[model samples]
Target chain A: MKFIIEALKRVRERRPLVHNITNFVVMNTTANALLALGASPVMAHAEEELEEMIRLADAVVINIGTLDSGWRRSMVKATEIANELGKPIVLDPVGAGATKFRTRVSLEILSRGVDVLKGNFGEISALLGEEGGEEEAKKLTMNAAREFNTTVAVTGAVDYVSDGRRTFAVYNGHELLGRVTGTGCMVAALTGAFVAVTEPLKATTSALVTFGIAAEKAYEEAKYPGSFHVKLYDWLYRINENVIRTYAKVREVE
Target chain B: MKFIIEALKRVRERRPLVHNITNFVVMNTTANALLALGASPVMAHAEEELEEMIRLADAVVINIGTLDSGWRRSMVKATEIANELGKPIVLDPVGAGATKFRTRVSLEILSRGVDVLKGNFGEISALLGEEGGEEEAKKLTMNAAREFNTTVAVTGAVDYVSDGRRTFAVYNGHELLGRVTGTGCMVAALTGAFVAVTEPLKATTSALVTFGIAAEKAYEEAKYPGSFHVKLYDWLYRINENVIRTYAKVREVE
Candidate 1:
């Protein structure tokens, strides 16, 4: 936990340039969240510029909420470059439950050797099983992690994280969070930011604690003030190390 | 009816240029719809030269359905330029109902003073107030309009328009529209193109009729084929004054 906190501080201190090939809906929130957290965001999907953008970034985040072939080609080309550079990649399967195309494409992204794969329960479920079964979901998710040596975080009211060797749950979120659009995707973006400076496990822990504790604290302090929307942003901007250290609700698999 | 028909024809005949600093989700959709309706869409959102892009546009459509500060900065700066240059601006608040951040920022966007602001019911309801509070929602929305100073359109199963003086209801549309993700925004973009060549009210009427009438027509002609999405695209291209004259329910404001 302490190591991850230092890592987040390092990443923020360094202000790494993280490239995003994101969907349209959360582009603004994603960009702002990255900037607010002390990282630079570049949103480019021009196939002609993929190699160049990938070459310029310290890390990359790719989201497939809105799938299209042109971006698919760019993502592949850019991933090859990132793979060559050995930069960590974060893949988010937004709305995996909503469509087969998203589910299949998420598996395809996972195949590209993501350092971390993160999504909501529905999103992770879609990736793990095509209605195969819950057992299959656990097996498939574990297989992908074990085979690729990657970390996966499945977010919910009770969040889950696994590296195939270890698993944990982080219980810290407000029901009001589900009311906010783009919050989950922004968390995935924060995962990439943390990954830019830390090992996957440390990055995973800090990201969870930082966001989760903040959310829990926010919920505890929330005013039925008729404004859960912008206040969440204020809370994120204002969350401190003490709050994180004190309020983190992490528990190990054992 | 003739006025609306002639307005659509004039836009088609003149084929004005429209500039969009749009989101990633519907880049190709809006571009094609504009082209189909005889307008050109130039989508360039690089921070380096968005001001110049705004200067070159006959009308600017700034959509924050994908909001953030970088694009938000560009939207504000470009809107300032648009205001100075006296060009029309259309604002589309997509998924405005989905989050606190989105709804708050959307109002900030309306603060930039769009010539017209457009949304679906869920989105407008989200922005105006929590759903199920009809009177308070109306009062709050009215206060917001006073705060922002722009014409607003809210499209639900039944659509509403408020120009501050009067509120009009649009009672024509098919349920099939909700099946499409970018349909509402595409209509906003199409409406932007149509009005780029004529008066705002007349253009709104043209776009509203064109959009609703086409859906009704295409539902019958395309016969709900699995390829209906593809066919819908083609139908937008083939639409014109003849189609609007042949099939439309636009009328005098009452």
Candidate 2:
């Protein structure tokens, strides 16, 4: 809990630049999430500009929600450059199981080396070629973390994060978070910001806890999805140490 | 004002499907805006699927905000198919003046015959190769409408729409709209929904008035951008004939 607070402080102080080669659907949502959470976000995937953009970024996020041949090329190129430059990278394999094309793209990006692999249960399970209760989800997260040698964050009714050796659970989110589109992608993009300031395991856990807590607060203000979505950003901007300390429901699993 | 209210009623009753080949940034925002305003929204830009998607849509919206050669190809193809099918088409030439590439693409799409063209002052000016106070913007809108044989919508603090001869000014918008990204694109997407139920000129004016009134109501609830944005959607969902009749500030200009 203390680490999460400190990590968020670091994110605010550093205002890390998170470069995203994300899907078309959530570009605005992801960028606004980063901005409200006290980080700078840049969305670029033009092949000619990836090297320079990644060079200027503190971290990178790759989301395969709306993939095409051209965008896939940029994602691969971005992963390669980020690997070579030693900048942290976060991958959200959105809808990996829904299509072989997406699964292949997710696997290819994972093979390149990702610092944090964030997705829902289905997406992460698809990546590992497996099929979850909470216990099953925890096992899947650990398996994926070990298999990819990266932090695996599986979000659901309750969120879980693991690095093969250790795991944590976050229980602060609201159902309204699911009502709006791109909330998961927004969390993945925020992980890019947090990874720039801390280790992947802590960063992924902190990002989920922060977003979940914000959603919980937002739901208190607005019951419907439309109002809840806007208030989510407001809470992200307003959430502080006291709020996180009071609401964060995180625990380590042996 | 009665026309605006009736147009919205038609949109809700019909739940028109708006097909968008738009930028990466506002896909979710645009989709949510349409959904909240009582319309269905579909975003597909693949050349392989454009014909089928456009065929099923009540209206098609082509935005050049995140243009690439591949997306440009799809936009042009979608335009051609929409024209052939006689489904209403709305084009948003985002950032036209900022780049020659964008300008050329906007012109090419216009040449294909657009039903309604919506953009901000700078974007519309860029399309016209001239630049605006209110009078200049009105002239620009009329000029662009006459040049392209399409209704033109120029959105700013005060929004202006022209159909070559008659022009209308909308004064219901709030300053906070400019603070959030994609409000213009969102309006253009809404125009697609409205156009599905009414003519291009009435649909354009109705979309702007409804969106502006929603923004004004959103501001009354939340002073900040993040909260205001959410409430904008909420108001969109909650806005009714009475609200539009009360808050709408629209009039035809000589």
Candidate 3:
């Protein structure tokens, strides 16, 4: 909890620029979420200037939610540059299990390597080759974490974060998180904000804890899921070290 | 009035699948809005599986907001499949006038065929080769609907919906609807829901009216644009036949 709080404090102090080669769907929401969390987000995919953009970024995030060939190429290219620059790179393999094309592209991004790979159980399951049942997912989560040599976040009812050797769980999210479409995607973007200041495992786990807690708080004030979406952002903007220490549901898997 | 209410009832009971090949920005909000109205929205743009996906869908939506050659190809391909399968299709020309490339692709999608073509007055005016001023827009709405032989919706202060032969205006929306980024796109998805259960003219107008009414209700409860986004969905889920009958501000154009 102290670590998470400190990481967020760094983000607040630095207000880092996060370059995003993400999908079309969550560009606005992700940008808004990053802004709410004290980070600046730039959605640039044109290969012509991606390197230039990455050069100015403190962190880079790649999302394969809505990939076409051009965007896919840009994802790898952006990640390659971010890696070369020694900046943190976060990957969100959205809907990796839903289509062979999505799975293939997600693996292509993984081959280039990433600092953190955040996805739902279904995505992680598909990346490592399996179906999407919950029980099967937990076993594969550890498997993927070990093989990838990157921090892994399996987002769901309870988020599992691991860096091969160390693993943690965050159980602060609400049911309304599933009701809103981009909450998972927003969490991935939030990871980028934390990644800008900390290591992948800590960054992603802290990101999950923050989002989960924020969602729970938003749910408290809003009676319906629709209202929860806006309230979630408001809480995200207002969260602090005190709030994190008070509300975060986090524990070591060991 | 009975027709619109029956359409909403059918959507609530049947929960039809809506296949959307849309821009990246609005995917989350569009999906949530469709879900709120009791329809399943699948935002799949991969050319590989669109055929199979559309086969299971009752309606298809295509939006030209952010275009690449690959996504543009997928949009035309998905629309072709939806047409072949005899499913209702709604097209949103998101920024037809903003760029030459956007205009060309949006026109290409229209050439293929569309059951309902919905866009802001600016988009419709550009498609009809005119400026976006309201005076010209009213004339072009009729022109585009007749020329394209599709149900047309010109979204603005007072939205106009028509099939060339029949025309209507919905004055039910709030100013906050324009302030939110995805409200226009959400209305496009809403059109798919209504189209799945009604005739093109009735479907587009009913979709606009429902969206407009929901926006007014949401605006009443929220203080800011961000908060209004969630309230919009909450009202959509709660709106009924009685609410539409009592609150919707719709009238005939002829």
Candidate 4:
């Protein structure tokens, strides 16, 4: 909680620039999410500009929700540049388990290295060559974090984050988060914002906690998906240290 | 008013599938907009599946906000397929005047023929190769419609739609509409939905009126941009014949 609150304060004060090579579906949503959270966002994937863009950014986010050969080339190139510049990189392997192509591309990017790797349970499971289950998900999350030497997050009913050694459970989000598309991608993008200012494990945990709390508050204002989605952004902008101290429910796992 | 109401009814009843090869920024927003309006939206830009996707769609939308060479190829190919299948196409020339690349691609797509061409005053003026203003915008709207042989919609403080022979002005939108990113692209997607079930001119008018009224209603509920954006989607889902008849302020130009 202390680190999370400190991280949020730093993010607002620094207004870190998060360079995103994200999907077609969530580019606007994620960008808006970052802005509402008091972080700057730039969505640029042109291979020619990747170097300069990543160079200026505090962090880089790569989401493969809508990938083709051309986009893939840009993503790979951006990853290399971020590495060269020593910028923290966050990868969202969207739809990793849905297709062989997606799974292969995700593994390839994972091999390239990232500071934080965030995805859903199924995506994390697929990366570890296992079927979907909570127990398997936890194991896979830890394994992936250790194997890749990065923080791994598998978000679902109870979001879990592992840094290979320590694991944390965030029981703050609402099921309504699932009702909207790209919420997970938005979380990954938020993680990039936090990673820009803090370490990977703490950043991943803080981002999930903040987003989950916002989702819970948003559901209070509007139960339906559309209104709930709107309020989510509202709460993202409105969330503060006091709110975090009051509502955040994060616990370290054994 | 009567045609707009009838068109909204047909759109909800038929649930027309709107195929989008739109920009990365608005894919989710536009898809959600179409879904809220009881229209189906599919965002597919893969060249191999463009034909099958368009074959299944009732209308097609092409946006040039995030165009690169590869995406440009997909957009052009999708346009040709939509033409071959005789599906109505609505083009959103986003950032038309921003770059020679964007303007050229928009012109190339426009040259292939579209049923409805929608853009802001600046973009419309760019298409006409003129400077921006209200008088020039209105003139360009009509002239572009006449030259391209399509319905041209120049959206701004007062939205105008022309089909060369006739023009209509829509006085329904709120200024807050501009506060959110991709609202224009969402309007273009909505136009694709309306065009699926009605004529190009009426479809453009109906979509602009519907979206504008929704923006107005959303503002009444939430004054801020984040909440206003969510409420916009909610109103789109909730809007009906009574709402349109009550709030629509469209007038046909002499």
Candidate 5:
């Protein structure tokens, strides 16, 4: 934790390159979100140079929210190539349960291997079960995360993360964060930045802790969701060692 | 009426590509609106690919709202291709009265040929009459629209349109639509989609009807003017079948 606090200053100095093979819906939001968090974000999902962009990026984030056959093929190729180069890969399984294609691609990438797997509880459970209800999904996630050989994160009203034996939850966020689009993808981006610095497993947990903490604090600076978004970016920009030490809320959850 | 409606459905189902060789002012809003209404919008303003993208697109929407010499060249190139290919060509003359360079280009494009010419009272007055005031400008639009040879629209508190012979007005929008950025350009895209269906002249009036109707209905769904924008797209989706029977306030302004 102390080392992360010290490394926080390196952000404005390092401008880590983040490549996104993301859905069209979240492209602009993700770009601005990374800029606010003091990292460089590049969203290049073109088939011609997915490998080139991934190699250039410090970390590659994959979102399967809007997928077609071509996008799917490029995503698989990009993740595989990035893993081969040992570049950190941040996986966002957006709407993973809605289609077999979405679920199949996410699992295929995970089986090929990634440093961290981030998604909603519903999605994570769907990956681990015959079919998942919320309760069964939560149970399946806890069990599967222990066996998956990668750090697993489940985002919702509260965020849960586990790396085999150790588990933690971040319980700081605002409701309006739900009302707006793209905040989840932004979390994936911040996770990519932190993962670039520390152990992949712990880094995502820390970054998500920071993501939730920023939201809770920003709501104080803003009265409603409308203005909360602006304040959220401001708070994200201000995040550093002191803010993390003072405000971050991450602890073991049962 | 049925034919126009059928064409709109095809646009939504096919999501026909609309190439916007537009100025920078409306990039965010216009692109979002196009996506919200089920059209794929590509904002490739580079002079190198303007003609190429125009050839690739189903319709080409051009706006001379923020003028520059280089962009003007692309706009002319795009329109030339649209004219030759018989693609729907819609031109938005944003603030024609504001400057010399702008007025010159607006005239240049209009003279060369366009399927539809969209502007406000200020723009049409500045384009049609050399007159600088409302009386002279309105008089010029009143008499001159009959000879414009293309669909001409004048948007204001009371929106007006005439294709050389027939003229009408549609009044169903709120005062709040003017407060936000890019609403004018969004209307230009709305005009483009509608014009993609019917004769350019009839499409102009149809666009005015649907746009005003969408705005009024969106006001009912919004929490505020700012949040109303994305919801405005939602209303655009719901704006069929009962649209004319329940919402249109169009009439001859006599």
Candidate 6:
């Protein structure tokens, strides 16, 4: 929890430049969320500029939510460069279980190696070849951590994070979080920001708690989903260590 | 007048599952708006699931805001399935006049059968191969509605909706709606929700009125662009039949 507080301050004080090869549906939402969180986000999907963009970024994120071959080519090329440069990379396999193509691409992204693997329950479940339910979700998160040698965050009603040896649970979010699109996607971008400065497990867990807390506070002011969505952004920008220390519900599980 | 209220109530009660194959930029905005308006939205663009997803949805929405070959192919495939199944499909020609690739795809989608076609003044003007201005826009909307056998919703300062036989105008929206990135895309999604429950003209008109009314309310709360983006959704979910009936500047233009 102390590290979570410290990590939040570090991110605000030292804003990282994040390179994002994200989908079209979330370009604006993701960019705005990143900006509100004190990080600079650059979204470029052109295959020609992938390497150049990643070369200048502190961290890289690849979201296969709106995947096409052209975008996939750029993601792969950029991931290779980010790997060579030793920059932290985050992969969000959005809708992984919903479609075979998405599942296949997510598997390919996992094989390439990532510092942080983030996805919702259905997505993580698909990646692990399990039925879509919360019961198996935690095991999938832990398994992915061991298999990929990476930190994993499986986001849902009760979010879970693991790094093979250690697992953490963050229960601080609101159902309104699901009402707004790209909240999970922005969490991936937030993870990119955190991992740029700290280890993957701590960074991902902190990012989830920080985001969940913001959502919870946003829900406090406006219970309406639309109004809550707007307030959520304001709170993400406004939340401080005190807010996190007082509000965050996190636990380290065996 | 009562039909508009009834239509909104139907959408709220039915919670139509809308399949949106839109651009990367507006995914979150569109999804949130649909959810707030009591519609279920699924954004799936993979070639593998385009047909299957559309088969299960009450309405299908295709936007050409950000076009690539793969996404374009999926849009075409989904449109064909929707038409064959006799389900309503809404087409948003986002950047029709801006690029040759977009213009070509927009025409292709129009050639195929679509229930509703919505776009901005610039997009409509470009679709008709005319310089963008108000004088040509009305004619373009009417011409498109007649020629393509579809409802045409042309969005601008004063939005126009026509189905060749009947023409309606909504004068309720604020300019702040344009300041945000995906409001237009959200309007298109709202159109899908309405059309699933009512006729094309009323659906498009109600969508424009409902969305415009929300924008007007949001503008009253916050004047800032970023903050207004959040407030807009809040108002969308908050708006009611009374608000629309009292505030909507809707008229059947001759």
**Top DockQ model:** 6
Query: Each candidate's lDDT (Cα)?
Result: 0.69, 0.90, 0.84, 0.88, 0.72, 0.85
Of candidate 1 chain A, the 10-residue stretch with the lowest lDDT total is A131-140
lDDT of 6 at A20: 91
User: Can you write out model 3's per-residue Cα lDDT over A1-254, one digit (the tens) per residue?
Assistant: 88999988898899999888887668888999999999999989999998899999999988887776667788888878888989888999887877777788878778778989889877897888742244455566678987777888888887888888888888888986765776788998989999989988899988999989999899899856687777888999899978998998999876
B100-187: candidate 2 lDDT, tens digit per residue: 6677889898888999999988888888773218999899899988878999998888889999988899999898675476888899
* Native interface contacts kept by each candidate, as a fraction: 0.03, 0.27, 0.42, 0.27, 0.00, 0.58
Candidate 5 versus the native: TM-score? 0.57
> How many clashes does each candidate structure show, in the order listed?
3, 0, 3, 0, 1, 4
lDDT of 6 by residue, B104-148 (tens): 888888888899999988887787663225546677789878877
TM-score list, all predictions: 0.53, 0.66, 0.81, 0.66, 0.57, 0.83
Query: How many clashes show up in model 6?
Result: 4
Chain A superposition TM-score, candidate 1: 0.88
- Per-residue lDDT tens digits for candidate 1, residues B82-156, read 888888888887656554555666776666667777876567767656322434434444444444576666666
Share of reference contacts kept by candidate 3 = 0.42
- Cα displacement (Å) at residue B124, model 1: 2.5
DockQ of each: 0.03, 0.18, 0.39, 0.19, 0.05, 0.45
Proportion of native contacts present in model 5 = 0.00
Report RMSD for candidate 5.
Answer: 10.2
Candidate 5: clashing residue pairs, number: 1
For model 3, name the residue pairs that clash: A24-B24, A24-B25, A25-B24
Model 6 interface CAPRI class: acceptable
On TM-score, the candidate that comes out on top is: 6
Task: Evaluate model 3: give its lDDT.
Answer: 0.84
Which has the higher TM-score value, candidate number 3 or candidate number 6?
6
Encode model 4's per-residue lDDT on B1-254: one tens digit a residue: 89999999999999999999988788788999999999999999988898999999999999987777888899999888889889999999886775566677888888888999999988888887832266666787999898788999999889889999999999999986654778889999999999999999999999999999999999899876688887888999999988987898999987
